[PDB]
Amino acid sequence: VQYEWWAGNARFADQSGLFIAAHVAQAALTAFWAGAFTLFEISRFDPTQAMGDQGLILLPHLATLGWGVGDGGQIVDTYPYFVIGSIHLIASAVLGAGALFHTLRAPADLSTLKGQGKKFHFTWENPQQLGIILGHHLLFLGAGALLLAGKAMYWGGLYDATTQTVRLVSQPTLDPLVIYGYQTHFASISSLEDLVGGHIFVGFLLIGGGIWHILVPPLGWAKKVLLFSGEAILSYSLGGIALAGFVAAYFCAVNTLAYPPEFYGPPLAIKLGIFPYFADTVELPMHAHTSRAWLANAHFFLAFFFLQGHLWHALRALGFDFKRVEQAF
Amino acid sequence: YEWWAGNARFADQSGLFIAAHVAQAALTAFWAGAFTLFEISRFDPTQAMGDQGLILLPHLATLGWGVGDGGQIVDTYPYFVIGSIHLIASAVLGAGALFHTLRAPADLSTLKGQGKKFHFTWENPQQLGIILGHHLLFLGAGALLLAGKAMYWGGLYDATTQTVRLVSQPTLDPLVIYGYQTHFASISSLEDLVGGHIFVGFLLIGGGIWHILVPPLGWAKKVLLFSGEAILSYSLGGIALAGFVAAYFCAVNTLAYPPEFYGPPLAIKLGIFPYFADTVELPMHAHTSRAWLANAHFFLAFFFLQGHLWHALRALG
Ligand code: CLA
Ligand code: CLA
Ligand SMILES: CC1=C(/C=C/C(C)=C/C=C/C(C)=C/C=C/C=C(C)/C=C/C=C(C)/C=C/C2=C(C)CCCC2(C)C)C(C)(C)CCC1
Ligand SMILES: CC1=C(/C=C/C(C)=C/C=C/C(C)=C/C=C/C=C(C)/C=C/C=C(C)/C=C/C2=C(C)CCCC2(C)C)C(C)(C)CCC1
Ligand SMILES: CC1=C(/C=C/C(C)=C/C=C/C(C)=C/C=C/C=C(C)/C=C/C=C(C)/C=C/C2=C(C)CCCC2(C)C)C(C)(C)CCC1
Fold this sequence. Notes:
Chain A: Keywords: Chlorophyll, Chromophore, Membrane, Photosynthesis, Photosystem I, Stress response, Thylakoid, Transmembrane, Transmembrane helix. With about 325 residues, the first copy, chain A, is mainly α.
């Protein structure tokens, strides 16, 4: 088959080197937006005023971790933001280095190699090596969860918005029955110590899922209840990231504990006119909104559009290319 | 190759390569010495050294030769003798350039004496490893020359107390040198500058001894391309990155060298094109020497990034 130049990235479906290269380049663009815009939207910051009114977009996430804040919720420094931005710069540098190295120098078909590349070629009809890739990615996401768990033990703990202190969390929960009953108490637990205690359980859960995916492949029913094509696997990933975007918009709307209210903004209100959105209780006159409303709304619309993309790839994968032509006789 | 790619003709000869490079070295030393001698004549002692657009005399003012106490100028004879030694060195390098064009042959394979171990190609790794190690040895020699000029041959100028201070008690631990990546644009002290310079002097002389004493292994020959335009691409990307970070270094650092020789601290401006501007105004509408240097080094570094891009496209397929 042939694809036009307006949409021609489907040629990454069989070529594996470009499949690695374009995605690592995309991650390089994400890390470049993380590093560059932190060091570029720093001149808009003023510690005399608040953080919710000026429209700071990146720096709320850095003050969430509890690096350069103390008693009362005030910012007296920039140097932790400087070192996190700088490690994001050099991480984007090395990640774009590997990206363009795979784009320009590495071969496209990984099965035509001689060293440790022919054992690295993937395709869309195996449950074993794709399960190995899923296991390694689950290991790395669980390692990020381990880093979130160690943030509450290494650098003085996370930031608390109730007690206005960067306190060290040293009380882990030794019971998963509280974790079962959290489905009513979503973003209403009124405790910052239970968030890390829920993070160690899901972190060890991610390690166990990665161990299960490395050790054993899909044992037979996933070949029947699921598909392995690129459009179908793209559909599953886009549905997962759309559910993540919707629950992140809900956490940016209602929580006001992990996100500090004096930095991000006030608790929001769920409204619906033409489209459903979130509005501040304290409006701003200069056609501006807080970081809460901006983040929650933008992640809601992006999660909706990626749910529509998931439905598009699901219709593309399951043979429904163009079958609504038979409406009119 | 007809008159518009003319330097690429002797790229494969590798006998007049040496002549072109020592001619370029002669031109750089000529510009250095002759423009110190030029800017000595157009120098005002009463006015500040940045408002009249002076580059190399403030660059020698960091070394503390022709300056005193309070930001003033004691004399111009150290700048004069430094530019004079640079001019005589450019004369002998241009003499060596005319030597290597005329009396030296087009290829070093015709030579039969003791200089036959100087011929280099684009095929063997050990020769260019020896060249890289000797150049790293000379860079470490320049770093220990700065160490000697800082400790046992003179003092430095500090922007903190505004004097020429012979700096003792340098940085002696490798922890804070590892941590100076976090704050490199603001060194915030000159004792850390000289201590880290002795640290990187030891580091680069260790890399030089490691390079000449150990031949290349072979794990990078299958990854990196061993062509002339490829090594030109690697060095061009290195010097373009160094020029960009040196321009950003010049834009904000007001105490690696003191700012009374350059003017106000430069401010960034990011619009359709990035450029650095001052805060005060000058009646000539001429920007300060720091404002000339940082903007020119940023634009030359960006054009060198594009040149390394073009040479890396030409080196690949
Ligand atoms: C992880 C996400 C992801 C990935 C990998 C893909 C991958 C793919 N999609 Mg796709 N898609 C996604 C998300 C994704 N999509 C979402 C979220 C939507 C809903 C909005 C769609 C809607 C969609 C359609 C409708 C079609 C595809 C098609 C394709 C395939 C062809 C290559 C391509 O992208 O065309 C590259 C195409 C472009 C770059 C578009 C051309 C330029 C446009 C005009 C600019 C972008 C418009 C936008 C408004 C710009 C502003 C951005 C805004 C955020 C500010 C390719 C396999 C096509 C297909 O099936 O194969 C032919 C196809 O027809 N996708
Ligand atoms: C020190 C760095 C360096 C080195 C050693 C080289 C070396 C080389 N380049 Mg090159 N290049 C560089 C940087 C460098 N380049 C940069 C930064 C760029 C981007 C602008 C380019 C763009 C470039 C192109 C587009 C081409 C080369 C080519 C070549 C090769 C042949 C050169 C020749 O005789 O024709 C080069 C041409 C001339 C010498 C004559 C025209 C040059 C004009 C007169 C210069 C005018 C600029 C002006 C005086 C400076 C203003 C600055 C201001 C401060 C005053 C040679 C190997 C050619 C090649 O690969 O062969 C096919 C080729 O086509 N280069
Ligand atoms: C506690 C806590 C926490 C945690 C959390 C967690 C732990 C979570 C989990 C989560 C989870 C754990 C989830 C789950 C989900 C699930 C789902 C979502 C699924 C889906 C699936 C699918 C979709 C599939 C299906 C199928 C099959 C099976 C076959 C047939 C067909 C189909 C395909 C349909 C936090 C951090 C917040 C903090 C606080 C507290
Ligand atoms: C190879 C070649 C080339 C190149 C060459 C060159 C360019 C050269 C250079 C050369 C040089 C560049 C030289 C220089 C010289 C100079 C001189 C020789 C000067 C003198 C002076 C001095 C040394 C001193 C100083 C002084 C004093 C001390 C006192 C007062 C007065 C005065 C200031 C004078 C060309 C391109 C052409 C062509 C092709 C080939
Ligand atoms: C801060 C400071 C300092 C220091 C400095 C230093 C110590 C530096 C270092 C630096 C460093 C030490 C650097 C490094 C760099 C490196 C580079 C820049 C690289 C890159 C590369 C790339 C990116 C590529 C990649 C690759 C490879 C590697 C292999 C093959 C493949 C490829 C090509 C891909 C001082 C003392 C002066 C004083 C005070 C301030």
